[PDB]
């Protein structure tokens, strides 16, 4: 029984640790090719299954209506490179590492999505993944500028038709269609390249895709989104799921809930790999590790933290003085109008303590509220990973980076070898495709 | 006074020579990263200014409305990779070569175009170019599933506002906005990052762009489109122009006309570089060159040739038997209703002879009618490039490949050194950016 | 049953074709890393078993005790880079291709040879080869400050002990000696690293080697030397043999002779792979190919060919006039005292005739007298290779380059795919080491 | 006025910190190409002047003529790859970084040293350096099967002629000798390529060298050897000096003495750059750094230090009891029969206390006695480098690695940017050669 490992970070200034760009070890090379090439090569040296990128299309002015926080202090999406370009860059200099990009079904037509990932899948020789998200934000809306705003759960309904359209397109070409018979002049068998002719309620695409199928057949479908409608969506489509849980109990529930949704949709639950995100901080001794973590968490500015907390909760908390205690917010707006997730974050993060908005945002900024921080030696981290795996937390772990590129160098040089020595993580790539690393079947046309 | 050199080929089976995939030397590696990496490194080894890719978003299927000729025999766009992914791949393995991609203003929002190229421009450290095109044909639309028919000249009017929007977005970040002051916690100066708030007749985008400016400020604007409206457009926006002319008389006229449009738009004509395309075929002796050219041209299948000729002429010629002579086509449609390009191509390619459709399509397939074929020794090709340059044909030449990747290995190894010894082509890159190679000024925010 | 392919060229101006540096396509980049990196990456792209380099440690100056000819016209070894440095350079940018260097047993101590190749073998993860040679020439000696005389056959007797010393050194480290037990503080098992204490008639070396064994155990032994003593030496030590024969029948005879020597030495003949050198000249048509061979052969200066002919035959022909007829030299030297190779060359070149030594030197300069020039289409060349292989000419072919880097780009693009489609050449590397490519066993400690 | 930076480490298990291979972060990849490619790319990313490697031609078995200590516990030179091969590997994947290798004048002929470094200088396009050393040890002489023992100072006398011989060889080719006139058939001007025919007291070399001059003319001469005879030697030949001093006071004296010896040799002291070695240990806080230093030092086994200390003293400490008080040991020899370096070191223990032999060996294993360990934050390390530089300690610093590859990643990511912000270290390479980086003149032929 071996676990999977994945890397994850924004093509930009911040991922989960909101003080990361301030870290003494941060190169902040996120505008340069070299930065991404170093990181991709490092994770491949550590035999990672994959690396994938989140995405948002707007700087967030969202809290509360301003960039002065985001841009001035380095909040979420202050810098955000288009993710598919970035992984093409990474694909060019690796040969085994799987690579994923987050693209919303909202903003692009299925033809575009299908061709972009089929192209990347071929260029990388069958190593690509699309992380499917159904987001719609007005600012993103403001940027791409389209306002018909569809309700959260209906976006997933549309996304069902979207995925079907994309997969029809990826099946345009039989895997034996291309002939390249030079002598005879037969380029391809036109009876094995078929029109798509899709017309559903939401979308219309004609086809065929002008891009044949790679050696893994189709890109791997990644999925992120844990809403009840999102888990149903994952049951039907996800081949790997991006999850975040603060502790083993929540990890195990999410795991079993997702595997249940998959089985309920008629699919094999062992063909959907669940990853849970964890943020390790290493030290030669546990003491050093805990001091490094303390240093890391002290870089978070209370307002950048609050900004993200405002965005994730849907409540704008900039409207209040920063010293407002959380119970004066519930007092001021009534418990019915303060999101549950926000009341559950205040209770868990404060431990019963009535915290100011400053301190709540500061703590939220350390780890986005729910990504577990693990401080310890390489041996301790290896142990924790192995025991969570054995307790059924996940099929693999996403390693959320405290600072870049350095943390991945530390994790690969110190933690990966220990995992290999215990026999719970690959010593070498067995196959060449992302499907093979993940133990997924090669889909048929 | 030095000339410029550019590479050009589709990320796919065919560019201008319709027998290229059948050439004994063709690797047909156009689905692999390696193919593109080899070519990009080769052109950088030869100190080329740039390489750019065309694009079409559908298998050309009009003649007449079928997969079978295009796919079966390997016509235009039978395989067509998404071009921006492809040059991202090339950028990761080069450090000087300029890289361009053709993207239509029709099918994407200005926000997308701006973010993709800003990303590539940053990933490549200031080496990227967008080749602006305004196309819109029904099959591509059928894929993007849209009902629109903006008339040709109106597409250019919309493109004016489009470019304006993209350039506003690329000016979101001043070049001194990014601070990365870790000690003070100041990421960036928010007074140097500006909202865009563009609301024009055609488009609306708010901004700012989440991507700072590269060391060359903004991507270089390439343009392709030689219609009277397109030349006006080039006058206003183009920093480099993609042109194709069958002989020196037409090259010089196109040259002077473009430079005139640029001056008429209030811009400096020497800040718009005109490239003209030529298809060289080398041999150790002139005799060897001519036999290789004859071999190359003998690979063109008459029906693939005819397919492209139909698409370009706007006339479906599948309806006729292949042995139909061209004058029964003129009889069948009336001299008035025969597109001018089609009448000029028939007269030029036949030299007055009445040709079958097979033979007309076959000759069109050799060079898309109007790309000059130059057979000779390295010294002769070098001579011809120099004399055309001295005769005011162009500021630079696009080298259309008879077959890939080999032809570029030959060109870089045999012709480039001769140009360098004569002092008309750079022996080494003087700058690091595409603007520096082309001698373009660094634009202000 | 598949054939093997090897590349072979001098790290310098000339290999077998003496007009190569003058070829219009020759880059003459033999002083730069880029030149060697390109060729290695190209031969790896073509799935070649290996690439190796010859060596001489002095500008040939025997004819006529001066460098005016060698240096002035670009003769053998006019430029000659140190070969182990070069293949280290190639190893760094490849991961499958085997890489070999010729080093003479005469000029270096066994410890030095062992350490250099053990190092390269580790650096390349098991892809290195030593081409064993026993040369001793005075100019080389003059350079090394040696005033050593040892007779041809005795040099080989000495080499037997040399090989034995080197192979002991490569067994210094057991393959399980290295522990890297950090926690316990045990670097390596001291009972599995052993002193050598070699004290023989010729050499003494103590050991152990400071370099452990790579994944292929030991560097592959290549050998070049076709003399009667040379074949015995190959019989005992060679794992691969570099041979040259002018036609299939002699190829076949040398082939069986070497396999017989291997069997006579008590070894398995299928564990010594025989390569024979061939010089292909490709053309799209046979006519083009023959014109290209004619062009290439016309670049040879009669005196450079003659210079080389002198060095291989042992007679310095410089003293004679260029119009000295060949039977007038044997008249004044007797059937008894002019070398055997020298007139199996003259007759073969005339096939009957009396030529001036100018003409004899010119013809020798094209292909070093005995390397067959094969001009044809890719299909014909592929046919001939398969046909010679099936006829028992060799286990593999050394592809002698008419000019560099260009000829290898053509061969990999045109001939290799044809071999692969016929199933007689690997479509992909099955293993990672040079031993696995050659189908050699992993030697024991 | 900027300081220079150099990297330095053995191609093997240990450099100065003898517990390094045991460090949790050490990859111990010293047998793989990847390990060296990574370190070299990292130092190039950090704009280092140079990286050079030490060497020994035998496993360190002196204490006590057995390998059980050296091999069993991982003392210095237990694994030691041939250094010229290693830097060739590094040169292939870098384009600016300087690269040097240590080769003894004792064991190789001048022709061999000359050709290897001329070859490397060309492969690297002028970035190479030879670190001149005059060592002669018994284990090493018995691997090369040498039995002549030359007195310490005489080896340096021999070395004087050695360098003249090597520099003569490097002037074999005029920098305008190579012509490559393909049309005229003139390879090179033979009157600009000269025989050497060097015959002095010690050595004889004929020439010419088969390798032309690189872009920087000749390899840079590094030297290491601080005996009085070594410093006179450095005065005459060295262009950069490797020095080690435990504090600013000794640094400054060593600095000024070397500059004087150079002036005394009639050379410009500004044209010989002196480097001093320091071993930094970084932490996010000073507390963290001091702890990481403690961890590092706690990995040192007392006997490996002594194994290594035996050779440096050159006294064999192997059979004195480990708890032998040092002074008591002092007595059999007589204060007069004690090598001094060891003696100051006893002094440099710094407690001036009678110390166990275990304990002297432990401390020596820590930092080779005299390389200062600096623990602190990046700012503190930068400060100390700047303040030492300004106080005239050295023209540049050698950064001795606590553990590899990681410490260089930390150093380049944390300290270099700070040095750059202060303007005391280059933000970018101004030239392409090692001579340009060090501010050395281009020597003429
Ligand atoms: C762990 C995780 C990571 C996510 N990352 C992104 C992301 O990078 N970009 C995005 O648009 N949506 C992302 N989402 C999904 C958003 O929640 C999104 O707004 C979607 O509409 C709702 O997903 P949901 O099922 O959580 O409601 C992520 C969701 C999860 C659970
Ligand atoms: C040399 C040249 C190359 C062109 N390449 C493309 C291309 O690759 N893709 C595309 O959509 N349009 C391309 N075009 C422009 C097409 O003509 C396009 O349909 C546009 O609507 C009309 O441009 P026009 O000004 O030539 O009419 C190119 C035009 C020229 C002159
Ligand atoms: C095909 C072939 C290639 C050879 N290449 C070299 C070489 O590059 N350098 C060298 O010193 N000897 C080379 N030799 C060996 C020389 O002939 C050498 O001087 C040796 O002492 C005699 O080899 P022999 O067995 O052919 O007589 C080669 C031999 C053969 C058959
Ligand atoms: C900082 C430094 C580093 C040295 N490194 C080496 C080395 O790696 N290999 C070597 O043989 N000698 C090295 N030496 C010099 C040795 O002492 C050498 O054996 C020589 O014979 C005597 O040099 P000396 O002048 O210091 O006595 C080094 C010397 C110094 C000062």
SS3 A56: coil
- Half-sphere CA count of C157, side-chain side, radius 13 A: 8
Q: Is the peptide bond before D107 cis (omega within 30 degrees of 0)?
A: no
A135 CA: nearest ligand 1 atom: 21
Backbone angles phi, psi at A132, to 5 degrees: -80, 130
Q: Is the peptide bond before D384 cis (omega within 30 degrees of 0)?
A: no
Q: B22-52 as b/e, with b when 16 or more CB fall inside 10 Å?
A: bbbbbbbbbbbbbbbbbbbbbbbbbbbbbbb
Helix/strand/coil percentages in chain A, nearest 5: 45, 15, 40
> What is the number of other CB atoms lying within 10 angstroms of the CB of residue D60?
24
Please report the beta strands in B142-267, taking only residues with DSSP state E, as ranges in sequence order: 178-181, 186-188, 198-199, 204-205, 220-223, 240-243
- The CA distance from D313 to the nearest CA of chain C, in Å, is 22
Q: Does the CA dihedral B105-B107-B111-B116 come out positive or negative?
A: negative
Rounded CA-CA distance C193/C205 in Å is 15
* Residue where the block lists tokens 């050296």: D70
CA of D104 to the centre of ligand 4 (A): 10
CB proximity C27 to D under 8 Å = no
8 A C-beta contact, residue A215 and residue C428: no
8 A C-beta contact, residue D363 and residue D371: no
Rounded CA-CA distance A405/D406 in Å is 12
8 A C-beta contact, residue B131 and residue B52: yes
Structure tokens at A353: 């303590």
Q: C360-386 as b/e, with b when 16 or more CB fall inside 10 Å?
A: bbbbbbbbbbbbbbbbbbbebbbebbb
Rounded CA-CA distance A418/D439 in Å is 46
Rounded CA-CA distance C229/D316 in Å is 48
8 A C-beta contact, residue A394 and residue A272: no
Instruction: For residue B41, give Cα distances in angstroms to A91, B45, B94, B281, C420.
Output: 17, 6, 6, 21, 26
> What is the number of other CB atoms lying within 10 angstroms of the CB of residue B267?
16
Question: Do the bridges between strand B273-282 and strand D240-243 make them parallel or antiparallel, or are there none, so unpaired?
Answer: unpaired
Q: C157-169 as b/e, with b when 16 or more CB fall inside 10 Å?
A: bbbbbbbbbbbbb
Which residue in B52, B166, B31 sits closest to B101, CA to CA?
Answer: B52
* Residue where the block lists tokens 């036999």: B291
Please report the beta strands in A151-303, taking only residues with DSSP state E, as ranges in sequence order: 178-181, 186-188, 198-199, 204-205, 220-224, 240-243, 273-282
How big is the CA angle at D67 (ends D65 and D68), to the nearest 5 degrees? 115
Angle of helix A326-333 relative to helix A340-350, nearest 10 degrees, comes to 160
Rounded CA-CA distance C207/C11 in Å is 32
The residue whose CA has the least distance to atom 27 of ligand 4 is: D227
Pick from C14, C225, C240, C261 the residue to mutate for probing ligand 3's pocket: most ligand atoms within 8 Å of its CB.
Answer: C225
Burial class (CB in 10 A: 0-12, 13-18, 19+), B253: exposed
Structure tokens at C35: 């030149």
Rounded CA-CA distance B435/B442 in Å is 7
> What is the number of other CB atoms lying within 10 angstroms of the CB of residue D236?
18
Which residue in B283, B235, B277 sits closest to B256, CA to CA?
Answer: B235
CA of residue A139 relative to chain centroid, distance: 21
The strand pairing partners of B181, in sequence order, are B186
Helix/strand/coil percentages in chain C, nearest 5: 40, 15, 45
Q: Does the CA dihedral A14-A19-A22-A27 come out positive or negative?
A: negative
User: CA torsion C104→C105→C107→C112, rounded to 10°?
Assistant: 100
Which residue in D193, D168, D204, D209 sits closest to C58, CA to CA?
Answer: D209
Which residues touch D165 (CB under 8 Å, ≥6 apart)? D110, D111, D114, D196, D198, D200, D203, D205
Please report the beta strands in D232-317, taking only residues with DSSP state E, as ranges in sequence order: 240-243, 273-282
Q: Residue A140 region, left (φ>0) first, then alpha (ψ -120 to 50), else beta? A: alpha
Which residues touch D119 (CB under 8 Å, ≥6 apart)? C81, C82, C85, C86, D211
Give the 3-state DSSP-derived string for B112-164, with helices as H, strands as E and coil as C: HHHHHHHHHHHHCCCCEEEEEECCCCHHHHHHCCCCCCCCHHHHHHHHHHHHH
Burial class (CB in 10 A: 0-12, 13-18, 19+), B131: buried
Which residue in B225, B282, B281, B275 sits closest to B398, CA to CA?
Answer: B275
Which residue in D333, D155, D161 sits closest to D227, CA to CA?
Answer: D155
Which residue in B168, B65, B159, B148 sits closest to B103, CA to CA?
Answer: B159
User: CA torsion B315→B318→B324→B330, rounded to 10°?
Assistant: -10
Backbone angles phi, psi at C398, to 5 degrees: -90, 125
CB proximity B246 to A under 8 Å = no
Q: Residue A351 region, left (φ>0) first, then alpha (ψ -120 to 50), else beta? A: left
Rounded CA-CA distance A120/B32 in Å is 10
Rounded CA-CA distance B170/B208 in Å is 9
**Total count of residues recorded for chain B:** 445
Which ligand approaches the C-alpha of residue D276 most closely? Answer: 4
Rounded CA-CA distance A229/A226 in Å is 8
What would you measure as the largest C-alpha separation in chain A, in angstroms? 81
8 A C-beta contact, residue B74 and residue B14: yes
- Residue ranges per structural domain of chain B: 1-445
Backbone angles phi, psi at D335, to 5 degrees: -40, -30
Which residue in A209, A172, A173, A159 sits closest to B143, CA to CA?
Answer: A209
User: CA torsion A426→A430→A433→A439, rounded to 10°?
Assistant: -70
The subunits that touch chain D, with at least 3 C-beta pairs less than 8 Å apart, are A, C
Q: Residue A368 region, left (φ>0) first, then alpha (ψ -120 to 50), else beta? A: left
How big is the CA angle at B336 (ends B330 and B342), to the nearest 5 degrees? 55
8 A C-beta contact, residue B212 and residue B204: no
C222 known ligand binder:
no
Give me Rg for the CA atoms of chain A: 22
Way the structure was solved: X-ray
Rounded CA-CA distance D50/D44 in Å is 9
Which residue in A195, A53, A209 sits closest to A119, CA to CA?
Answer: A209
Q: What is the DSSP string of A115-131?
A: HHHHHHHHHTTS-EEEE
Q: Does the CA dihedral C200-C204-C208-C214 come out positive or negative?
A: negative
8 A C-beta contact, residue D163 and residue D238: no
**Total count of residues recorded for chain C:** 445
8 A C-beta contact, residue A276 and residue A243: yes
The DSSP H or E segment spanning B396 is: strand B396-399
> What is the number of other CB atoms lying within 10 angstroms of the CB of residue C286?
13
8 A C-beta contact, residue B356 and residue B337: no
Question: Which class would CATH give B1-445?
Answer: alpha beta
Rounded CA-CA distance A160/A223 in Å is 13
8 A C-beta contact, residue C219 and residue C128: yes
Rounded CA-CA distance A160/A143 in Å is 25
* Residue where the block lists tokens 């099946």: A171
The strand pairing partners of D204, in sequence order, are D199
8 A C-beta contact, residue C57 and residue C11: no
**Total count of residues recorded for chain D:** 445
Rounded CA-CA distance D209/C60 in Å is 12
- Selected for mutation to probe chain A from D32, D409, D416, D421 (highest A CB count within 10 Å) is D409
Pick from A104, A135, A162 the residue to mutate for probing ligand 1's pocket: most ligand atoms within 8 Å of its CB.
Answer: A135
CB proximity A62 to B under 8 Å = no
Rounded CA-CA distance A17/B88 in Å is 28
Burial class (CB in 10 A: 0-12, 13-18, 19+), B303: buried
SS3 C296: helix
The DSSP H or E segment spanning C147 is: none
SS3 D280: strand
The strand pairing partners of D241, in sequence order, are D223, D274
> What is the number of other CB atoms lying within 10 angstroms of the CB of residue D443?
15
Rounded CA-CA distance D287/A292 in Å is 10
Is B123–A85 a contact, with Cβ atoms under 8 angstroms apart? yes
- Selected for mutation to probe chain D from A292, A409, A414, A418 (highest D CB count within 10 Å) is A409
8 A C-beta contact, residue C127 and residue C99: yes
* Residue where the block lists tokens 């001295």: B390
Which residue in A224, A225, A278, A260 sits closest to A389, CA to CA?
Answer: A278
The chain C residue lying nearest B29, using CA atoms, is C413
Which residue in D162, D165, D186 sits closest to D176, CA to CA?
Answer: D186
Give the 3-state DSSP-derived string for D129-182, with helices as H, strands as E and coil as C: EEEEECCCCHHHHHHCCCCCCCCHHHHHHHHHHHHHHHHHHHCCECCCCEEEEC
Kindly state the DSSP code that residue B372 receives in the 8-state scheme. P
Instruction: For residue C147, give Cα distances in angstroms to C143, C151, C350.
Output: 10, 13, 40
Rounded CA-CA distance A308/A297 in Å is 16
Structure tokens at B262: 């640029």
Kindly state the DSSP code that residue D419 receives in the 8-state scheme. H
Q: What is the DSSP string of C276-288?
A: EEEEEEE-SSHHH
* Residue where the block lists tokens 């079928």: B66
Rounded CA-CA distance C428/A262 in Å is 38
Which residue in A263, A262, A245, A246 sits closest to A254, CA to CA?
Answer: A245
Which residue in B257, B251, B281 sits closest to B269, CA to CA?
Answer: B257
């Amino acid at each position: 029984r071996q676990l999977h490992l994945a890397g994850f970070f924004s093509a930009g200034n911040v991922t989960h640790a909101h003080g990361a760009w301030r870290h003494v070890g941060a190169t902040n090379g996120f505008l340069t090719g070299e930065f991404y090439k170093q990181i991709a090569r490092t994770l491949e040296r550590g035999k990672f299954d994959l690396l994938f990128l989140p995405d948002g299309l707007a700087i967030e002015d969202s809290y509360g209506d301003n960039l002065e926080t985001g841009v001035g202090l380095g909040g979420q999406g202050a810098v955000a490179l288009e993710p598919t370009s970035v992984i093409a860059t990474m694909a060019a200099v690796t040969q085994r590492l799987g690579l994923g990009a987050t693209v919303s079904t909202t903003y692009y037509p299925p033809y575009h999505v299908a061709r972009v990932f089929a192209t990347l899948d071929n260029l990388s020789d069958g190593r690509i993944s699309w992380n499917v998200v159904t987001s719609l934000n007005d600012s993103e809306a403001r940027n791409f500028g389209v306002d018909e705003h569809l309700e959260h759960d209906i976006r997933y309904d549309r996304a069902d038709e979207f995925l079907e359209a994309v997969k029809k397109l990826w099946s345009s070409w039989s895997e034996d269609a291309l002939l390249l018979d030079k002598v005879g002049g037969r380029f391809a068998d036109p009876k094995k390249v078929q029109y798509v002719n899709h017309r559903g309620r939401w979308l219309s695409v004609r086809g065929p895709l002008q891009v044949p199928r790679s050696r893994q057949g189709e890109p791997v479908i990644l999925q992120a989104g844990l809403s009840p409608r999102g888990r149903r969506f994952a049951g039907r489509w996800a081949e790997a799921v991006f999850s975040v849980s603060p502790n083993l109990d929540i990890m195990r529930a999410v795991y079993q809930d997702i595997k249940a949704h998959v089985a309920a949709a008629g699919r094999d639950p062992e063909q959907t790999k669940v990853f849970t995100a964890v943020m390790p901080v290493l030290g030669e001794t546990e003491q050093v590790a805990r001091e490094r973590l303390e240093y890391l968490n002290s870089l978070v500015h209370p307002e950048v933290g609050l900004s993200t907390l405002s965005s994730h909760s849907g409540l704008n908390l900039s409207k209040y003085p920063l010293d407002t205690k959380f119970s004066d917010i519930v007092a001021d707006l009534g418990d019915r109008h303060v999101p549950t997730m926000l009341q559950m974050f205040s209770a868990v993060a404060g431990g019963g303590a009535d915290l100011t908005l400053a301190e709540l945002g500061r703590r939220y900024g350390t780890n986005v509220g729910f990504v577990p921080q693990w401080a310890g030696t390489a041996e301790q981290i290896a142990d924790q990973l192995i025991s969570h795996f054995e307790a059924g937390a996940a099929d693999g772990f996403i390693i959320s980076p405290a600072y870049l590129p350095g943390i991945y160098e530390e994790f690969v040089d110190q933690v990966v070898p220990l995992l290999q020595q215990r026999g719970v993580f690959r010593t070498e790539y067995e196959g060449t495709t992302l499907r093979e690393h993940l133990g997924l079947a090669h889909p048929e046309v």
